[PDB]
Amino acid sequence: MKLNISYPVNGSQKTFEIDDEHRIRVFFDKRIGQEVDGEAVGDEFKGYVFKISGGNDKQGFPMKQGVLLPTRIKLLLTKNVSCYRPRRDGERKRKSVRGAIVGPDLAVLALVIVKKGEQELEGLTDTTVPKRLGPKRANNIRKFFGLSKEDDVRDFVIRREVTKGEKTYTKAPKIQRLVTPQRLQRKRHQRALKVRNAQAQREAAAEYAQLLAKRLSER
Amino acid sequence: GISRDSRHKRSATGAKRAQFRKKRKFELGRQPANTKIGAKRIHSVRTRGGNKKYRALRIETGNFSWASEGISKKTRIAGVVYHPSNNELVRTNTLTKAAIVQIDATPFRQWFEAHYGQTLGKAERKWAARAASAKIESSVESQFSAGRLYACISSRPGQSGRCDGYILEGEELAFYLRRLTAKK
Amino acid sequence: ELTVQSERAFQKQPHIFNNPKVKTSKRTKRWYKNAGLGFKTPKTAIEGSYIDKKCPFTGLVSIRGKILTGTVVSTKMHRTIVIRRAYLHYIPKYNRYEKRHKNVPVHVSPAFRVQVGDIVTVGQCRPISKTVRFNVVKVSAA
Amino acid sequence: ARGPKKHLKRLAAPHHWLLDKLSGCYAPRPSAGPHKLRESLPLIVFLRNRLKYALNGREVKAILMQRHVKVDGKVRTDTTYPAGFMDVITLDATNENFRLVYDVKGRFAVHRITDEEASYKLGKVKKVQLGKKGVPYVVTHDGRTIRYPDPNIKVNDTVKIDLASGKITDFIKFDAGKLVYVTGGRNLGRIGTIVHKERHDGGFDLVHIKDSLDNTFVTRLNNVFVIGEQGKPYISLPKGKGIKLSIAEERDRRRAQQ
RNA sequence: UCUAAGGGUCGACGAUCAACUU
RNA sequence: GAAACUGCGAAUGGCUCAUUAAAUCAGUUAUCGUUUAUUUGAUAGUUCCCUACAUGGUAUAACUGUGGUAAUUCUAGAGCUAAUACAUGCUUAAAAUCUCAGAUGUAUUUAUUAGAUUGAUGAUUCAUAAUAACUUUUCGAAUCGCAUGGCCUUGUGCUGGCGAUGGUUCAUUCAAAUUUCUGCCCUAUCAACUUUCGAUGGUAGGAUAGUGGCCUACCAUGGUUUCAACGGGUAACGGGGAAUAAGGGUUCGAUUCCGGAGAGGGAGCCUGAGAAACGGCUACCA
Ligand SMILES: [Mg+2]
Ligand SMILES: [Mg+2]
Ligand SMILES: [Mg+2]
Ligand SMILES: [Mg+2]
Ligand SMILES: [Mg+2]
Ligand SMILES: [Mg+2]
Ligand SMILES: [Mg+2]
Ligand SMILES: [Mg+2]
Ligand SMILES: [Mg+2]
Ligand SMILES: [Mg+2]
Ligand SMILES: [Mg+2]
Ligand SMILES: [Mg+2]
Ligand SMILES: [Mg+2]
């Protein structure tokens, strides 16, 4: 009986091995999203409210987000669902998934910390991970670092130094949707091609109408 | 699924045909729409060649044309009063091409008033230009006093998602009025 | 056709509108066409009151395939006959022929009047029934 | 059979490619393009079998990917581009221009032409149709649509196509007494003058052609291509000018080289 | 809860009347 | 430049001949009875009810870390991250007529009109245009590369190349699906068959990409047949062809090409332009 507990705030997670039934009956019959607290589960966690979202049973089947059963059943799974990755465009497979309501069958639960009650866990706030990637889009960097539209956002893009061969040439990410004279020239080229084509069609039609009104003059 | 093939459907001599060529997707049929009235619900069907059909279920409004003054107002379908193929469609008010329905007639009366100004059913001299020759008929206006105009569906709701049609007029209207005063 | 309006639906040619506003002469505007290939549109088709959406002159079908000739052997269907098409089939081993025939179901417009006998000319049209792919175009009541 | 075939087995290719039998199992399947599958001639075939410039298909694509070959003014880097009748194959490395025309045996003859007449090409007007917005257009034998055509250009006429602006400079009208190439049938590759056109409403149009030597052969209108008037072809004719000598006089011409 | 078909009398239809069987 | 997302392909090929006897197939037709990715050619000044010097995550992958199962090309939980993925959304006057300032591109649906004697066809209710409206919104590039040029209010100026990819419609091509006519071996110890339960036709509808009893409702009583229907057999896939052959024929053709069908037996279906796909899925049987 294991507990994969994750702290999304600032990034963290770790696993516990709760080997007593009395201190884990607080999860039985809870399906998804309940205020199961630290004081209710074990002495160590206290004031920690666990968002109980997912888990795996013995024989390794994951949980299904909304099946609402205490056993495992077979579903025809599709593209945009959990527990299945389609190996081919349009593929669907009948896979046995485990229900949403927790019980003893679960070999491991998956909990999300949503409230901090008392003394921090040693893998909860002290040790934290950075965000692996900074924003890539121009407006994403603007929305991140607060700078407004007219701020010339190509300067403080988060970088990374590679201590590999004593040269450490920083790999700054390319930014997309950036307002650039190349894109402005592409826009101008398209919006000028359109009017050029329209004028060409108009003059071709005019001269053909001239030909018609000339060859109609014969009577 | 449903197949439109003729490999079943025994030959004209009456012989039962042997089977080959397990059902092909290019011969498939599908389920009828059985378009009802009210609270528009249209489902997109993916058809051959990547095209799309629109299965109308529960259609509420249709575009109906008078065809004598050429207006084609958008109006509400009240119900089905006659269907030449199945009385069950009349019973169930199933919207379908060639169904004889009743329409609101209010946009048509409003257009008649804004056009002729001649008190149909109860920029100055345009009514004068559209002169006294405005008498429509003795059966298309008597329905305006009840606010229900007999119309015939012309689109295919199960195919195009729309329930457009035209107002009954002349000998068509006389035919359907005879049918209605018989079966009603 | 003996009270042409004998169906549950109103029988009419599509998009052929008799405007009750305009005071035209006939009041029953009737569409017809020239079928092509030198088949004269009959006056029964021109002036009748039948509808026959499968008529080659007043209907929505075209004659665009094979032109065949045959002998009418049945007129027991509604607007459909069966023509017999006799021919001789060559058997090379005997350097001789054998009589063969093929019945062909054909749609006959009310423009024509056809009885048993009555060698007819028929033109291919789109499939208009399970077995019918031909429309009578010349009655030639021999 | 579940979709379009992408292979062309040898012995299923069009015979006029003169393809070797025991070379491989497959022939170059003409990609979709201007002319047809059967009436076409892939660039690989014309580069590796009609000129021997390349030795393999690999070398054909090597020649093609550096923009050497050019079909009707454009690059056409497609290894199996379906070039066909009246097409201009110009190569600037080894600067020379060919016009794909039919010899009298019915194959695509190698016909060098000069730039001053490779500038343009000919096209048989497949159809005259009004397009959207009421704009008339012509469709030619090579699949070209040309808007605002001359109101006197009808079906079966021929139009001279600029091939740089793609417009109609002149048009020859199908009538008794004009020079016509035969582009199909038994007489594929013959040249002659229209004598008479049999109508056959519903059926197929027939045309009687009289070559220079007064031989008179009939053929379907589908595969006759007006190329000008007698003695003034709007294009340059290949080495044989479509005379169709019989086997006896062909052997005689051959033995005249001793 | 309906639908259809199967009648009488009177003057291609109209008016009136009537009972059940499917 | 691994991985991954996206795109395209995987419906070709290759195998086999089990089914299959008017079925396949062959030659010959038709689509004025339809779909068609791609290729090729042409084609789109009309979009708005406080971003366009460029909109959002409402989004996610790969990746980072925590795992379950003995096992699968199984995946959960948490943190990022883009687009030619997804979803939105403007800039183009001028010209331009109708309605009583607004509408007028295209796409969908309906009705009406012209389409003559002002284009085409043997032939159309054709192409096409117009009118009045209609749409669980379609399209009308918020994309990418290599060069950077010219003029200049010398600035974040105005312009301007060659392309790639994408996109509406039309035509073209590769195709597909139906389709005309005629032609299949033995058997009557198979002579009547089909028709409630669609058999043949009519009307209407539904369904289809489209025609069509393809299906449904109502109606008619038809349709095939000694010129062999229907049934039975085939150790029958059809043909190009092969063996033998004075001539005529007899026999063969699972098999190098074309067409068909199938992937143990059936059935159903996702994706996609295209599969009723099986080196795709779903179920049952073995
Ligand atoms: Mg294959
Ligand atoms: Mg039209
Ligand atoms: Mg029908
Ligand atoms: Mg055999
Ligand atoms: Mg067998
Ligand atoms: Mg064989
Ligand atoms: Mg065998
Ligand atoms: Mg094969
Ligand atoms: Mg298959
Ligand atoms: Mg096996
Ligand atoms: Mg299968
Ligand atoms: Mg296998
Ligand atoms: Mg396969």
In angstroms, the CA D99 to CA D24 distance is 29
Residues B161 and B58 sit within 8 Å (Cβ to Cβ): no
Last residue of a domain, one of D171, D186, D202: D171
Q: What are phi and psi of A173, to 5 degrees?
A: -65, 145
Residue C73 maps to which CATH number?
Answer: 2.40.50.1000
* B100 lies in the same domain as B165: yes
Half-sphere CA count of D65, side-chain side, radius 13 A:
6
* B64 lies in the same domain as B140: no
Question: Residue C113's domain spans which residues?
Answer: 3-142
Q: Which of A208, A211, A215 to mutate to test the interface with D (most CBs of D within 10 A)?
A: A208
The encoded tokens of residue D195 equal 């004598």
Q: Which chains touch C (3 or more CB pairs under 8 A)?
A: B, D
Among left, alpha and beta (phi > 0; psi -120 to 50; other), residue A60 is left
Residues of C in contact with B68 (CB under 8 A): 19-21
Q: CA C54 – C1' F202 distance (Å)?
A: 11
Please name the amino acid found at residue B14: G
- Which ligand sits nearest to residue D7's alpha carbon? 1
In angstroms, the CA D50 to CA D189 distance is 17
**CB–CB contact D202 C38 (8 Å):** no
In angstroms, the CA D165 to CA A200 distance is 13
- Torsion sign (Cα): B89, B2, B28, A87: positive
D170-173, long-range: CB < 8 A, 24+ apart: D170/D234, D171/D125, D172/D226, D172/D227, D172/D228, D172/D229, D172/D234, D173/D226
Query: Residue A188, Cβ neighbours under 10 Å: how many?
Result: 11
Which residue is closest to C13 within chain B, CA to CA? Answer: B172
Q: How far is A208 from chain D (nearest CA, A)?
A: 6
In angstroms, the CA B93 to CA B98 distance is 13
Residue D200 maps to which CATH number?
Answer: 2.30.30.30
* B142 lies in the same domain as B153: no
Q: Is any Cβ of chain B less than 8 angstroms from the Cβ of C99?
A: no
**CB–CB contact C8 B176 (8 Å):** no
Q: What are phi and psi of C47, to 5 degrees?
A: -110, -5
Q: What are phi and psi of C76, to 5 degrees?
A: -95, -5
Q: How far is C94 from chain B (nearest CA, A)?
A: 30
Q: Is any Cβ of chain D less than 8 angstroms from the Cβ of A208?
A: yes
Instruction: Report helix, strand or coil for D16.
Output: helix
CA angle, residues A207, A189, D119, in degrees to nearest 5: 50
**CB–CB contact D202 C36 (8 Å):** yes
Q: Which residues of D179-206 are buried (b: 16+ CB within 10 A; e: fewer)?
A: bbbbbbbebbbbbbbbeebeeeeeeeee
Provide CB contacts within 8 A for A213, sequence distance 6+. none
**CB–CB contact B12 C17 (8 Å):** no
Half-sphere CA count of A203, side-chain side, radius 13 A:
5
Q: Is any Cβ of chain D less than 8 angstroms from the Cβ of A209?
A: no
Please name the amino acid found at residue B173: L
List the determination method: cryo-EM
> From the CA of D232, how far away is ligand 4's center (Å)?
57
Half-sphere CA count of A172, side-chain side, radius 13 A:
9
Among A132, A134, A124, A178, CA closest to A154: A178
Question: Residue D129's domain spans which residues?
Answer: 121-171
* D53 lies in the same domain as D107: yes
Q: Is any Cβ of chain C less than 8 angstroms from the Cβ of B170?
A: yes
* B19 lies in the same domain as B82: no
Among B106, B7, A215, B46, CA closest to D152: A215
Q: What is the CA radius of gyration of chain D?
A: 19
In angstroms, the CA C56 to CA A60 distance is 72
In angstroms, the CA A148 to CA A160 distance is 24
- Torsion sign (Cα): B143, B148, B153, B155: positive
C and D: number of Cβ contacts within 8 A: 7
> Could you tell me the CA-to-CA distances from D177 to A80, A169, A207, D122, D159 in Å, in that order?
70, 80, 32, 18, 17
Residues D253 and D245 sit within 8 Å (Cβ to Cβ): yes
Record the resolution, in angstroms. 2.0
| CATH level 3 topology of A131-219 | 1.20.5
A205-212, long-range: CB < 8 A, 24+ apart: A205/D135, A205/D148, A207/D148, A208/D148, A211/D150, A211/D151, A212/D151
DSSP symbols for chain C = --SS--SSSPP--TT----SSS--SSSS-------STT-PPPHHHHH-----TT-TTTSS----S-EEEEEEEE--SSSEEEEEEEEEEEEGGGTEEEEEEEEEEEE--TTS---SEEEEEEEE-S--SSS--EEEEE----
Tell me D222's DSSP state.
Answer: G
Region(s) of chain A under CATH 1.20.5.2650: 131-219
Tell me D43's DSSP state.
Answer: H
Provide CB contacts within 8 A for A136, sequence distance 6+. A173, A174, A175, A176
* D33 lies in the same domain as D66: yes
Provide CB contacts within 8 A for B103, sequence distance 6+. B62, B64, B75, B76, B77, B78, B148, B149, B151, B165, B167
**β D96-99/C67-74 pair status:** unpaired
Q: What is the distance of C-alpha B59 from the center of its chain?
A: 11
Residue with tokens 């207006």: B71
Q: Do chains A and C touch (3 or more CB pairs under 8 A)?
A: no
Query: Residue A187, Cβ neighbours under 10 Å: how many?
Result: 10
**β D108-109/D224-229 pair status:** unpaired
**β C80-91/A93-98 pair status:** unpaired
Cβ-7 Å neighbors of strand E:
B 87, 91, 183; C 2-3
In angstroms, the CA C50 to CA C31 distance is 11
* B10 lies in the same domain as B63: no
Residues C105 and C50 sit within 8 Å (Cβ to Cβ): no
Q: What are phi and psi of A198, to 5 degrees?
A: -65, -40
List the single residue in D148, D150, D151 with the smallest CB-CB distance to A204: D148
In angstroms, the CA A108 to CA A3 distance is 6
Point out which residues pair with C98 in neighbouring strands. Answer: C89
D95-100, long-range: CB < 8 A, 24+ apart: D99/D235, D99/D236, D100/D41, D100/D46
> Could you tell me the CA-to-CA distances from C101 to B112, C84, C86, C98, C104 in Å, in that order?
65, 7, 4, 10, 10
Residues A101 and A141 sit within 8 Å (Cβ to Cβ): no
Residue D96 lies in a domain: yes
Closest residue by C-alpha to C1' distance, nucleotide F71? A59
Residues A2 and A109 sit within 8 Å (Cβ to Cβ): yes
Provide CB contacts within 8 A for D25, sequence distance 6+. D9, D10
Question: Residue B117's domain spans which residues?
Answer: 106-147
> From the CA of D232, how far away is ligand 12's center (Å)?
64
List the single residue in A205, A207, A212 with the smallest CB-CB distance to D151: A212
* B50 lies in the same domain as B101: yes
Q: Is any Cβ of chain A less than 8 angstroms from the Cβ of D232?
A: no
> From the CA of B4, how far away is ligand 6's center (Å)?
31
The encoded tokens of residue D209 equal 């052609």
Number of domains into which chain D is organized: 3
Number of domains into which chain B is organized: 3
Q: CA A128 – C1' F75 distance (Å)?
A: 26
* B96 lies in the same domain as B112: no
Among C109, C106, C90, CA closest to C98: C90
In angstroms, the CA D250 to CA C132 distance is 55
Query: Residue B109, Cβ neighbours under 10 Å: how many?
Result: 19
Order of strands across the sheet that contains D69-71? D69-71, D88-91, D96-99, D112-113
Please name the amino acid found at residue B97: K
Q: Which chains touch D (3 or more CB pairs under 8 A)?
A: A, C
Point out which residues pair with A41 in neighbouring strands. Answer: none
Q: Is any Cβ of chain C less than 8 angstroms from the Cβ of D3?
A: no
Give the containing element (helix H, strand E) for B165.
Answer: strand B165-167
> From the CA of D8, how far away is ligand 4's center (Å)?
27
Gaps in chain B after residue (C–N beyond 2.5 Å) = 122
Instruction: Report helix, strand or coil for D195.
Output: strand
Among C70, C48, C66, C68, CA closest to C57: C48
Residues D171 and D160 sit within 8 Å (Cβ to Cβ): yes
Please name the amino acid found at residue A160: R
Residue D147 maps to which CATH number?
Answer: 2.40.50.740
Number of domains into which chain C is organized: 1
**β C96-107/C117-124 pair status:** unpaired
List the single residue in C5, C9, C17 with the smallest CB-CB distance to B67: C17
Residue with tokens 């924003």: A135
In angstroms, the CA C65 to CA C72 distance is 20
In angstroms, the CA A167 to CA A189 distance is 42
Q: Which residues of A153-178 are buried (b: 16+ CB within 10 A; e: fewer)?
A: beeebeeeeeeeeeeeeeeeeebeee
* B66 lies in the same domain as B123: no
Please name the amino acid found at residue C58: T
Q: What are phi and psi of B144, to 5 degrees?
A: -70, -25
Residues of A in contact with D148 (CB under 8 A): 204-205, 207-208
Among A134, A140, A148, CA closest to A176: A140
Residues A109 and A103 sit within 8 Å (Cβ to Cβ): no
Residues B141 and B66 sit within 8 Å (Cβ to Cβ): no
Q: Which of D147, D148, D168 to mutate to test the interface with A (most CBs of A within 10 A)?
A: D148
> Could you tell me the CA-to-CA distances from B94 to A198, B172, D83, D212 in Å, in that order?
48, 21, 57, 74
Closest residue by C-alpha to C1' distance, nucleotide F110? B164
B96-100, long-range: CB < 8 A, 24+ apart: B96/B35, B96/B153, B96/B156, B96/B157, B96/B158, B97/B153, B97/B154, B97/B155, B97/B156, B97/B157, B98/B152, B98/B153, B98/B154, B98/C9, B99/B152, B99/B153, B100/B150, B100/B151, B100/B152, B100/B168, B100/B176, B100/B180
Residue with tokens 């088709």: C45
